[PDB]
Amino acid sequence: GRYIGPVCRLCRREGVKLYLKGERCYSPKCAMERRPYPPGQHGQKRARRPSDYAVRLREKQKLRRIYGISERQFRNLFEEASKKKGVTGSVFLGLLESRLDNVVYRLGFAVSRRQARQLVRHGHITVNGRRVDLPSYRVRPGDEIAVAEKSRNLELIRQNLEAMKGRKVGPWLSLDVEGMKGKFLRLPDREDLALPVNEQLVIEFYSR
Amino acid sequence: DFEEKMILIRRTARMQAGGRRFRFGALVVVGDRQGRVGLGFGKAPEVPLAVQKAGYYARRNMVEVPLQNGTIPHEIEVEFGASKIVLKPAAPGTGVIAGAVPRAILELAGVTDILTKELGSRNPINIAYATMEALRQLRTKADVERLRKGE
Amino acid sequence: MLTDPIADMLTRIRNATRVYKESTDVPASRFKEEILRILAREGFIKGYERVDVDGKPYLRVYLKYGPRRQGPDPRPEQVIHHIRRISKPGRRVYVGVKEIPRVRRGLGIAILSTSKGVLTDREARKLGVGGELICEVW
Amino acid sequence: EITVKELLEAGVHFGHERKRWNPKFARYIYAERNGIHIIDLQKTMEELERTFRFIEDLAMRGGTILFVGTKKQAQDIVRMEAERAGMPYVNQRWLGGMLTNFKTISQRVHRLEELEALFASPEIEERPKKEQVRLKHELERLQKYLSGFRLLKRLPDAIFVVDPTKEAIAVREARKLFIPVIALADTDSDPDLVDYIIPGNDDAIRSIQLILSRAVDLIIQARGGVVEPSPSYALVQ
RNA sequence: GCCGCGGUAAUACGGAGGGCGCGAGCGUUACCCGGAUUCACUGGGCGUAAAGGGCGUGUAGGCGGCCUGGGGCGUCCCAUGUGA
RNA sequence: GGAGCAAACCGGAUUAGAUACCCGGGUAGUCCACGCCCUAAACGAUGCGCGCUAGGUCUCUGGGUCUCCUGGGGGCCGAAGCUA
RNA sequence: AAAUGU
Ligand SMILES: [Mg+2]
Ligand SMILES: [Mg+2]
Ligand SMILES: [Mg+2]
Ligand SMILES: [Mg+2]
Ligand SMILES: [Mg+2]
Ligand SMILES: [Mg+2]
Ligand SMILES: [Mg+2]
Ligand SMILES: [Mg+2]
Ligand SMILES: [Mg+2]
Ligand SMILES: [Mg+2]
Ligand SMILES: [Mg+2]
Ligand SMILES: [Mg+2]
Ligand SMILES: [Mg+2]
Ligand SMILES: [Mg+2]
Ligand SMILES: [Mg+2]
Ligand SMILES: [Mg+2]
Ligand SMILES: [Mg+2]
Ligand SMILES: [Mg+2]
Ligand SMILES: [Mg+2]
Ligand SMILES: [Mg+2]
Ligand SMILES: [Mg+2]
Ligand SMILES: [Mg+2]
Ligand SMILES: [Mg+2]
Ligand SMILES: [Mg+2]
Ligand SMILES: [Mg+2]
Ligand SMILES: [Mg+2]
Ligand SMILES: [Mg+2]
Ligand SMILES: [Mg+2]
Ligand SMILES: [Mg+2]
Ligand SMILES: [Mg+2]
Ligand SMILES: [Mg+2]
Ligand SMILES: [Mg+2]
Ligand SMILES: [Mg+2]
Ligand SMILES: [Mg+2]
Ligand SMILES: [Mg+2]
Ligand SMILES: [Mg+2]
Ligand SMILES: [Mg+2]
Ligand SMILES: [Zn+2]
């Protein structure tokens, strides 16, 4: 199944923090803070100039490693995107973001997408009143994601739900913090998040 | 200001009585990503001086690159020696579909959406020198009527 | 003999242009005519004049160019950057009104013989015809 | 006035060459008599008319013109002129790079000036008899190839040629640098590579001295004072 | 897989540590298309790189100059059926 | 038919050897008629015909109001252009 | 007269 194990090695290697843990990857020490250099014996050594391929490679993984999914599931979406209308590329992020488990991270019901997933998988999450246990669900506008009844309580939700009081959730997002529910509003334009990534290259990569 | 970029370094070697002496060659692109690109070729006893004088030589053969939002006004194909480059426009959200030599130019002239092929001798040097000559022969619907007139 | 006269015309021009001359004389036809015409109507040429030479009719075709550029080789840009026969006696090219060129993205112009005559890509599309593609020019 | 009419064109300034010619020299040709090609002067002046219409505007805004001519037919004529116009010139023999590598050759006139700083300076005697002549020998050559080039401290904005055939080197150097090219040319060379032309005998002092002497007068007449007729018809003829 | 690595200091063998890449999959072999514009209609060549017939005459065949008619075969348009 | 020449053949030299090179000999063949064979660096290593695109010089051969012009050949250098 | 060199 998914990637499991050493994560903080990945806020690094890619050479850029990508907030993959809970509070740690947000706390003074995200595998990069202390050691902002690539993993393994050859860490504190001077890099040689990457290949153009290498450059494109690292950029893709980064993005995937951010959303944290199989190369299987990942590329389908690219080709799907690659097939569609006009920009037929940048739209990609929209398809990535429509993932249930992705959304739940943004909706602050959890902090790691990894934590998000275990919820959806354990089916602590519902959509439009439906017990939905599938982290791949491409959600759409006006769909509603809320905690189920057997789990409205649960220590893990409350604090995770609470700490959200502070920030303006995504333009495409909305949250009844007390009501434990959110609405997918719209398709996040490229504007709506300057990811640390240059998606232009992922395209360039996948056209091998 | 400008945006340098080498796409080629190489080590030639003449020969002398006892041993072979060397020289290094460097091909640098220099752009603005706004429609201005240049290209010169550096040859010097050691590496960086060439690279340096490449970028010197580069900022000469500059070129109006009359974009039409991240693309070219029309399709062009040019032949340099026995090397051949095909330039084809593209609707936005396409990509810069090119080898490593020409994409290391079209980007620095702007161009976010273009289709390309190399044909004949894929030698980078003579390929580079070609592509420039393609841009230099780009003409705009504006550029044309200036000619298809009277007096 | 001349297997193809139309090609010979185009080729005569292309030869003349590359040395930047005033005029270019070429044997006459009512079909070579309404083929030129466009080249004035689209302003690829100044124009022509039906004349006679040594008792025999020709069509002095007057060449446009551009600005005396500067730098080494001050020779001006051409008006006619490119021109080549398409349909030939060795292989005749016919097209439906759909299957019709977008020469140099609108900047270029095809020339075709049709059920209404020497149209262009633009025209033949709008009249809704298509026919024997003679040549492409830009 | 400012100008000259075809009655003055009676020296040689009609043509003198033929068959040793470039056919580019069409239009500015009249007919072939005595085998020699002859060129109409209606156009010669018409060109001068056009040509001078670019010289004055250039001169009267205080530009600079470099003078080139290595023909023994036109050596000294230009020297006087460009001195009589206080302008730089190349009488002697032309050097590659001079414009395209201007910056580099320019450091050689400094040495000339740097040398001249040792004529009566307090170190001449204080440098041995041996070297004393060597530098003086190094001097006398330096001045020869840099006299009319010692003037100017930056590339001009036009250059005047007595025969663009020969100084095509210079013409190429100039042309590569968007530098306006003007020339007295006969059937020898050829137009196109010229921006402003004096189609006439580019040999036989008459045409040269005629058009060259008068050319200078045009400059002053846009700088201040066309003083007495400069030397000419001395041993000249 | 090709270019090639091993001759007492091997990032190329063998193990180890570490790293890259996929993940209930990862490799390999065989085969088809791509890249190959390397059968080239789109879209190539034949002086010295492989390629002009040793040279004529000529059958079928391919191709054909300038003008005006008739025919409308090709070609072009429209409509319609068919194209499961 | 056969003078001269000359594969093969013999001899003299050279050489380690010399079935070669150089030398003295020498038969087919070389020449004629008739009939076969059909190869080649059979080369401009460039197929044929027509049209178009600067000139300079040397020459062979026609015609011209014989400078010069023009026609058809045989070479050189060369505009533009082509070419690795 | 005058050969050869994992
Ligand atoms: Mg698309
Ligand atoms: Mg080629
Ligand atoms: Mg190849
Ligand atoms: Mg290669
Ligand atoms: Mg050991
Ligand atoms: Mg060892
Ligand atoms: Mg070793
Ligand atoms: Mg290996
Ligand atoms: Mg190993
Ligand atoms: Mg290990
Ligand atoms: Mg390992
Ligand atoms: Mg073909
Ligand atoms: Mg080929
Ligand atoms: Mg051929
Ligand atoms: Mg061979
Ligand atoms: Mg061969
Ligand atoms: Mg042959
Ligand atoms: Mg044959
Ligand atoms: Mg045969
Ligand atoms: Mg026949
Ligand atoms: Mg027929
Ligand atoms: Mg016919
Ligand atoms: Mg149908
Ligand atoms: Mg004998
Ligand atoms: Mg013997
Ligand atoms: Mg013996
Ligand atoms: Mg023995
Ligand atoms: Mg013998
Ligand atoms: Mg052969
Ligand atoms: Mg031939
Ligand atoms: Mg044949
Ligand atoms: Mg004859
Ligand atoms: Mg005669
Ligand atoms: Mg001839
Ligand atoms: Mg030649
Ligand atoms: Mg030339
Ligand atoms: Mg042996
Ligand atoms: Zn971390």
> Mind giving me the DSSP string for chain B?
--EEEEEEEEEEE---SSS--EEEEEEEEEE-SSSBEEEEEEEESSHHHHHHHHHHHHTTS--B---SSSS-SS-EEEEETTEEEEEEE--SSS-EE--HHHHHHHTTT--SSEEEEEEE---HHHHHHHHHHHHTT---HHHHHTTSS--
Pairing mode, strands C117-120 and C109-114: antiparallel
Distance CA B110, CA B66 (A): 10
Q: Do residues D94 and D75 touch, judged by C-beta distance below 8 A?
A: no
Residues placed in the known binding site of A for Zn(2+): 8, 11, 25, 30
Hunting for tokens 């959110």 — which residue is that? A182
**Structural tokens at position D120:** 């009566």
Rounded distance in angstroms from the CA atom of residue A118 to the C1' atom of nucleotide E20? 28
- For chain D, which domains are there? 7-94+151-237 (3.40.50.10490), 95-150 (1.10.287.610)
Chains in contact with C, where contact means 3 or more Cβ–Cβ distances below 8 Å, are B, D
C75 vs D: CB within 8 A: yes
Q: Which fold has domain B3-63?
A: Double Stranded RNA Binding Domain (3.30.160)
Q: Which residues touch strand E (CB under 7 A)?
A: A 1-4, 9, 13, 38-42, 57-58, 61, 70-72; B 117, 119-120; C 1-5, 27-32, 89-90, 94-98, 114-115, 128-132
Q: What is the CATH number of the domain that holds A149?
A: 3.10.290.10
Distance CA C24, CA B150 (A): 18
Residues D18-53: b if buried by 16+ CB within 10 A, e if exposed = beebbeebeebbeeeeeeebbbbbebbbebbeebbe
In Å, what is the CA distance from B21 to each residue of B16, B42, B51? 7, 17, 19
- For chain C, which domains are there? 3-80 (3.30.1370.30), 81-138 (3.30.1490.10)
Q: Which contacts qualify for D230-233: CB closer than 8 Å, 24 or more apart?
A: D230/D80, D230/D81, D230/D84, D231/D80, D233/D209
Distance CA D116, CA D124 (A): 11
Beta-carbon count within 10 A of D178 CB: 9
Q: Do residues B68 and B90 touch, judged by C-beta distance below 8 A?
A: no
Asked if C43's CB is within 8 angstroms of B150's CB, the reply is yes
Asked if B100's CB is within 8 angstroms of A86's CB, the reply is no
A82 vs B: CB within 8 A: no
Q: Which residue from B minimizes the CA distance to A88?
A: B93
Provide CB contacts within 8 A for A48, sequence distance 6+.
none
Return the DSSP state at D97. Answer: T
Q: Do residues C85 and B54 touch, judged by C-beta distance below 8 A?
A: no
Same domain, A88 and A26: yes
3-state secondary structure chain C: CCCCHHHHHHHHHHHHHCCCCCEECCECCHHHHHHHCHHHHCCCEEEEEEEEECCEEEEEEEECCCCCCCCCCCCCCCCCCCEEECCCCCCCCECCCCCCCCCCCCCCEEEEEECCEEEEHHHHHHHCCCCEEEEEEC
Do at least 3 CB pairs under 8 Å connect C with B?
A: yes
Residue D14 exposure: Cα atoms within 13 Å on the Cβ side? 13
- The secondary element (H helix, E strand) that includes residue D119 is none
Beta-carbon count within 10 A of D171 CB: 23
Q: Say which amino acid occupies B140.
A: T
Asked if D193's CB is within 8 angstroms of C71's CB, the reply is no
Q: Which residues touch strand F (CB under 7 A)?
A: B 79, 81-82; C 1-3, 8, 11-12, 15-16, 18-19; D 19, 21-23, 35
* Sign of the four-CA dihedral B42, B43, B48, B53: negative
Hunting for tokens 């007068």 — which residue is that? D217
Q: Do residues B28 and B52 touch, judged by C-beta distance below 8 A?
A: no
Chains in contact with A, where contact means 3 or more Cβ–Cβ distances below 8 Å, are B
- B94, B103, B107: best mutation site toward chain A, by most A Cβ within 10 Å? B94
Chain E bases under 7 Å from protein CB?
A: 17-24, 36-37, 62-68, 74-78
**Structural tokens at position B117:** 């092929």
Nearest CA to A39 out of A9, A8, A6, A4 is that of A9
Same domain, A36 and A80: yes
Report the DSSP beta bridge partners of residue D178. Answer: none
Chain F bases under 7 Å from protein CB?
A: 49-57, 68, 79-81, 83-84
Shortest Cα distance from A91 to chain B (angstroms)?
10
Adjacency order of strands within the sheet including A125-127: A130-131, A125-127, A144-147, A181-183, A175-176
In Å, what is the CA distance from A43 to each residue of A59, B83, D73? 19, 43, 78
Asked if D176's CB is within 8 angstroms of C72's CB, the reply is yes
Return the DSSP state at A50. Answer: P
Max CA distance (Å), chain C: 49
* Coil/strand/helix, residue A147: strand
CA D111: distance to chain centroid?
A: 24
Residues of the domain holding A158? 97-193
Give the burial class of A35: count Cβ atoms within 10 A of its Cβ; 0-12 exposed, 13-18 middle, 19 or more buried.
middle
Nearest CA to B136 out of B5, B42, B55, B37 is that of B37
Nearest CA to D56 out of D226, D222, D227, D224 is that of D222
Residue C134 exposure: Cα atoms within 13 Å on the Cβ side? 24
Same domain, A68 and A114: no
Domain count across chain A: 2
CA D97: distance to chain centroid?
A: 17
Same domain, A84 and A115: no
Same domain, A156 and A204: no
Distance CA B12, CA A198 (A): 37
Named by the residue before each, gaps in chain A exceeding 2.5 A from C to N are none
Asked if C106's CB is within 8 angstroms of B141's CB, the reply is yes
Nearest CA to C70 out of D191, D196, D178 is that of D178
Q: Where are the domains of chain B?
A: 3-63, 64-149
* Coil/strand/helix, residue A132: coil
Same domain, A200 and A183: no
* Coil/strand/helix, residue D184: strand
Nearest by CB: A207 against B93, B97, B112 = B97
Residues with CB under 5 A from ligand 38 (ion): A 8, 11, 21, 25, 30-31
Backbone φ and ψ for A69, nearest 5 degrees, come out as -140, 165
Shortest Cα distance from C61 to chain B (angstroms)?
15
CA of C3 to the centre of ligand 18 (A): 22
Same domain, A205 and A140: no
In Å, what is the CA distance from D57 to each residue of C10, D62, D219? 44, 9, 10
Q: Do residues D4 and D207 touch, judged by C-beta distance below 8 A?
A: no
- D50, D99, D175: best mutation site toward chain C, by most C Cβ within 10 Å? D175
Q: Right CATH number for B64-149 from 3.40.50.2300, 3.40.50.920, 3.30.230.10, 3.30.2130.30?
A: 3.30.230.10
Question: Percentage helix, strand, coil, to 5, in chain A?
Answer: 40, 10, 55
Q: Which nucleotide is nearest to C96 (CA to C1')?
A: E76
**Structural tokens at position D58:** 């250039």
Q: Say which amino acid occupies C125.
A: R
Altogether, the residues listed in chain C come to a count of 138
CA of A176 to the centre of ligand 38 (A): 30
Provide CB contacts within 8 A for D39, sequence distance 6+.
D14, D15, D25, D28, D29, D30, D186, D187, D199, D200
Chains in contact with D, where contact means 3 or more Cβ–Cβ distances below 8 Å, are C
Provide CB contacts within 8 A for C132, sequence distance 6+.
C87, C92, C93, C94, C112, C113, C114
